[PDB]
Each structure stands twice: as C-alpha cells, then as structure tokens.
Amino acid sequence: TTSAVNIYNISAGASVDLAAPVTTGDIVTFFSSALNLSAGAGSPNNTALNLLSENGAYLLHIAFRLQENVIVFNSRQPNAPWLVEQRVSNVANQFIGSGGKAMVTVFDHGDKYQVVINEKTVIQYTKQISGTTSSLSYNSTEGTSIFSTVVEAVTYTGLA
Amino acid sequence: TTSAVNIYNISAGASVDLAAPVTTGDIVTFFSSALNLSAGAGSPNNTALNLLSENGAYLLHIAFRLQENVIVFNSRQPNAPWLVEQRVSNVANQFIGSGGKAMVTVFDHGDKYQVVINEKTVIQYTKQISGTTSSLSYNSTEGTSIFSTVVEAVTYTGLA
Incomplete structure (x- = not known):
C-alpha cells in the first residue's frame, strides 16, 4: 500500500483545491502558528x-x-x-x-468526522452529508482571526 | 471509531516513551524548524x-x-x-x-515502513524486525545536526 502526504499553505479568505481527495480513513490537520483568543468570550x-x-x-x-x-x-x-x-x-x-x-x-x-484540538477530541460528528472532500477554505467571518494569517494544512491520504 | 493525536517535543539526545503505541496502520511525523545542509561531518x-x-x-x-x-x-x-x-x-x-x-x-x-520527506517518498523499507513502536529518539553529532535542537513529533494512532 502506498500512502501520500500533501502540504498546503492556506491564506485567510481563500479556498484550496486538493491534489489528492480526502475520503474515508484519511486525515487532514490544520496548523496555526498563532493563537489569538485575547479578545475573549463575548467578543465579535x-x-x-x-x-x-x-x-x-x-x-x-x-x-x-x-x-x-x-x-x-x-x-x-x-x-x-x-x-x-x-x-x-x-x-x-x-x-x-x-x-x-x-x-x-x-x-x-x-x-x-472526529475533530481534535491539539490532543483533545472535542466531538464525534455524525455526518449530515456524505462524500469526498476535494477542497478546503479558511474564512474570517467576523472581526479578526483566532489563527495566523496563513494556516498550514497537511493531508494523509491513501490510508484505508 | 476512536483515534488519537499525541504531541511530543524531543530535544537532541533524548528518548521519549509514547503515551500511545504506534502499530500497523499508524503514522508518526517529525517536524524540524530548521534545515542545515552544510553543517559539517557527523560521527558519522x-x-x-x-x-x-x-x-x-x-x-x-x-x-x-x-x-x-x-x-x-x-x-x-x-x-x-x-x-x-x-x-x-x-x-x-x-x-x-x-x-x-x-x-x-x-x-x-x-x-x-514508508518514509516520506516533505511530500517525497524516499523509500519503501522492508522491515528486518517486526513489532510495535513504543518509544522514539533523536540523536545528533554535537553542533552538526541538520535539524533544529528540538524536533516536534506527532503520532496518529488507532487508525486501522
């Protein structure tokens, strides 16, 4: 079996088309070189x-x-x-x-979809829509991002 | 169903015992914040x-x-x-x-063992010894390491 590693630099407000689709058994990890929570709870x-x-x-x-x-x-x-x-x-x-x-x-x-923040699983999300992931986006809906301007994404495909 | 992510900070010269063992179907990634291709000779x-x-x-x-x-x-x-x-x-x-x-x-x-550097598979290593990985080490030749003093390692276990 041959697995693959793909690296992406996602700027805020952009969408990236994956060179290798993410399907059952695969993994995607987002890396932020910053953490801006200083605004605190209740901020926009x-x-x-x-x-x-x-x-x-x-x-x-x-x-x-x-x-x-x-x-x-x-x-x-x-x-x-x-x-x-x-x-x-x-x-x-x-x-x-x-x-x-x-x-x-x-x-x-x-x-x-199992989501983990650092080492902590925060949710086991039962899918509402099934399918393969072929694109990823990172948007700042309101105010300032809680992450770095550019987020690094690494996908591990061809696992299952 | 339930997988896990574990993060380790390995300093040059140290060994670390994994909280979760790495077996068939699992992954281990090493991150270096530096790259020195002209560091000098190792011993060896x-x-x-x-x-x-x-x-x-x-x-x-x-x-x-x-x-x-x-x-x-x-x-x-x-x-x-x-x-x-x-x-x-x-x-x-x-x-x-x-x-x-x-x-x-x-x-x-x-x-x-499939080893990949960045996105490039460097080799498909046929195991000479089988078994489960329970610890990892990062050893260097004083002052000539090609990586950073501290290497971050992440393991994705409980996949298969």
Missing part, C-alpha cells in the same frame, strides 16, 4: 474552517464563535439552508494545552 | 531518528550523513550488531521542496 470574532465536496456542499463547517463562546459544527448543500448544528461550549478551554500555536485534526471515519 | 551521523520496540530493538534507524552524502536506513536487535543497511544518495535532493523547515513522515504498513 468568528473564524471558520471548511471541508467542501466537488459539488460545493459543506461537508463540515467549523465555526469558532467567541461572541457566543461556542464552537459550532454543521453542514449544508449548495444554495440551501444550514442543517442541524452541533455545539461545544467554552472555546478557550479546548485550547488549554496550546500556547502560542494550535492544531486542529479531522479524522474521516466514513459515517462520522 | 549528523542526526538520527529512531523507532524502538518495547524491548529496545531499533525497528527503524534513520541516519543522515552529510560527509558521505547519503541517508542510511537500518535495524538491529538489543545488544546486537546492525543488520542489512539500505542507503539513498544525495541528501539535499530529498529536501528540495523544504526551505528552512522540513518534515519526515513514517507510515507503518505492517511489512514495510
């Missing part, structure tokens, strides 16, 4: 990370909302409304192991 | 990364020798001599995609 800062399908559907939308002090997980089809959102309270608490930097790992287990 | 290894078994066997020894312009791969039992070595020439050539930083990934495929 919201940054997002998304895994998209070839048809443009949002297989996994990850929103770090400091205003409501929650991390939201959801999915939606193109030109359609957001589905059932899952939430995890206290943003800063999930990053406690961090310190100047952070990493977010998404495991595609086929029927679910 | 400028730097070496090792994967060890529960009984101290060197399942995978990765040695970089600048003065010999080669990368060596080998294994050995506890208190026994080195076995059949495999070598890949032209060190700099393997780091062509780098640029002040570098990463070394090792996939444990059961019968073989």
Whole structure:
C-alpha cells in the first residue's frame, strides 16, 4: 500500500483545491502558528474552517464563535439552508494545552468526522452529508482571526 | 471509531516513551524548524531518528550523513550488531521542496515502513524486525545536526 502526504499553505479568505481527495480513513490537520483568543468570550470574532465536496456542499463547517463562546459544527448543500448544528461550549478551554500555536485534526471515519484540538477530541460528528472532500477554505467571518494569517494544512491520504 | 493525536517535543539526545503505541496502520511525523545542509561531518551521523520496540530493538534507524552524502536506513536487535543497511544518495535532493523547515513522515504498513520527506517518498523499507513502536529518539553529532535542537513529533494512532 502506498500512502501520500500533501502540504498546503492556506491564506485567510481563500479556498484550496486538493491534489489528492480526502475520503474515508484519511486525515487532514490544520496548523496555526498563532493563537489569538485575547479578545475573549463575548467578543465579535468568528473564524471558520471548511471541508467542501466537488459539488460545493459543506461537508463540515467549523465555526469558532467567541461572541457566543461556542464552537459550532454543521453542514449544508449548495444554495440551501444550514442543517442541524452541533455545539461545544467554552472555546478557550479546548485550547488549554496550546500556547502560542494550535492544531486542529479531522479524522474521516466514513459515517462520522472526529475533530481534535491539539490532543483533545472535542466531538464525534455524525455526518449530515456524505462524500469526498476535494477542497478546503479558511474564512474570517467576523472581526479578526483566532489563527495566523496563513494556516498550514497537511493531508494523509491513501490510508484505508 | 476512536483515534488519537499525541504531541511530543524531543530535544537532541533524548528518548521519549509514547503515551500511545504506534502499530500497523499508524503514522508518526517529525517536524524540524530548521534545515542545515552544510553543517559539517557527523560521527558519522549528523542526526538520527529512531523507532524502538518495547524491548529496545531499533525497528527503524534513520541516519543522515552529510560527509558521505547519503541517508542510511537500518535495524538491529538489543545488544546486537546492525543488520542489512539500505542507503539513498544525495541528501539535499530529498529536501528540495523544504526551505528552512522540513518534515519526515513514517507510515507503518505492517511489512514495510514508508518514509516520506516533505511530500517525497524516499523509500519503501522492508522491515528486518517486526513489532510495535513504543518509544522514539533523536540523536545528533554535537553542533552538526541538520535539524533544529528540538524536533516536534506527532503520532496518529488507532487508525486501522
């Protein structure tokens, strides 16, 4: 079996097409060389990370909302409304192991997405939309990003 | 179903016991925040990364020798001599995609170890000794290491 490693530099506000699709059994890890939580809980800062399908559907939308002090997980089809959102309270608490930097790992287990912040699993997300990830985006929905201007993404494909 | 991410900071000269063992289907990645392709001669290894078994066997020894312009791969039992070595020439050539930083990934495929430098698979190493990796070490020749003093390692376990 031959696996593969792909590295991407994602600037804030951009979307990147993967040279190798992420499917069941594969992994994607986001590396931030900074952690800006200083605004604190209740501030209007919201940054997002998304895994998209070839048809443009949002297989996994990850929103770090400091205003409501929650991390939201959801999915939606193109030109359609957001589905059932899952939430995890206290943003800063999930990053406690961090310190100047952070990493977010998404495991595609086929029927679910396992998300881990640093060493802590924060959720086992049952998929609302099935499919292969062919593109990734990093957007600063509101205020300033909680991550570095450029995020490094590494995918581990051809595992299963 | 449930996988895990573990982060370790390995200083030159130290060994670390893994909180979660690395077995067939798992991955280990090494991150260097520096790259020195003109550091001088090693004695004879400028730097070496090792994967060890529960009984101290060197399942995978990765040695970089600048003065010999080669990368060596080998294994050995506890208190026994080195076995059949495999070598890949032209060190700099393997780091062509780098640029002040570098990463070394090792996939444990059961019968073989796939080693990738950045995005380039350097070799498919047929195991000379089988077993589970329970600890790792980063050894160097004083002042001539090609990597940073501290190397960050991340393991993805519980995959298969």
